[PDB]
Design a binder for this molecule. Sequence first.
Ligand SMILES: [Cl-]
Lengths: 256, 200
Amino acid sequence: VIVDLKFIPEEVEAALAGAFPVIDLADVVWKSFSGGAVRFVDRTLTTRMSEWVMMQCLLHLRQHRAYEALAKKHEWRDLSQPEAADVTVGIMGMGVLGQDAARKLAAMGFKVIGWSRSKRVIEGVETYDAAGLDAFLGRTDFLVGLLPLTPDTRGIFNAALFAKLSRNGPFGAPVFINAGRGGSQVEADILECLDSGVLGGASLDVFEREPLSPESRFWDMPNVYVTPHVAASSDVRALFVHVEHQIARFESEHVV
Amino acid sequence: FVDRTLTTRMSEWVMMQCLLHLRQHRAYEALAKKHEWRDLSQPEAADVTVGIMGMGVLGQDAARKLAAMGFKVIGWSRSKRVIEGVETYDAAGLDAFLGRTDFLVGLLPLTPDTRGIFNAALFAKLSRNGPFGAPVFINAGRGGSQVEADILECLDSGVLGGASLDVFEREPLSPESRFWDMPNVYVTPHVAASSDVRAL
Ligand SMILES: [Cl-]
């Protein structure tokens, strides 16, 4: 089997031991069977994404940066701490990813509301539509972006949207979390809102131009968490089980 | 004063620690400090076993929530307990429990049965077969249940790969403690659950 994948080479090399019981062209294609989304539909992407989203909401809720700054000073000091039920997480995007995250955040105690341009009826979650966007934003303390990039979501996360987020929550200023696509945000507005305090903090997994430039100001900011577009990663061992099975079945799905 | 929010608050902290360790937060922050964009190989929660010692109210709440997030979860208590949805181990099953555990979570009360229970000999029985090759220790019960000199020695030797500590043998933790500067140790000042003073 020909393997030409621009993934982590060590993870590919390691995953070949056992797989296809192998012309590895770094010595099945992704920037040379597709390596990602005959396509590969990795069933673990949703649950992986929800781990990242949950982690961001907890990092912000539990004041991780303030406690780490105290730890760096070797200073023992308890801070006033809201519970998850004191914070409304507003999720823009009520597809598979938004629905999974909503359910899990609510089970952890967060108040959760959802938004999509056209109304969706989601069991257990109050949802808002385009006409209800202002009301949705005004209730939201932690804004979570799980939207696709379409013409309707180009630069949707912008200065005016951030200015309509709630300032009535326990931190007095909203937080922005995005793991959809960088084209959905106006990065200059995010930076200016962080500098001005309109946004109290952010978690960004996606950027207008990836990989994020080493000169970006996002890297050093005290209340911004940067991840390199890894909210969900495929396991290459899972890809080969998909290729083995589809190679075997063909010898005995998911054609584009 | 019985603050009804303590359980759910505790589970927030426990969930946060398990995700911080799972998602390699320290490694990604070190990358960010270098302004270096680099993806790391990433297990999913289903690749990690969280073993919770203490299957009272706190342990049960945490176990349920960790399993809903995708973690493999097992529980331990000295007495046999049957807990819906969670595999549990008893006194006789302690060594088996430890050998299956990648992230050890302490949610025990402090009694003569739990005094200094988290010690070098216990850490030596934890799994090294998980995706990081070394176990992690997380404690939010009481500091009297751990032997801090053993935690430090195990971190130095690599017997423990990292830790999250909310409780300590002597609180407040001394400014001279080695815990504060370690790259894979998270320190919180006994705040896994705080009572809301308006409720008092
Ligand atoms: Cl939408």
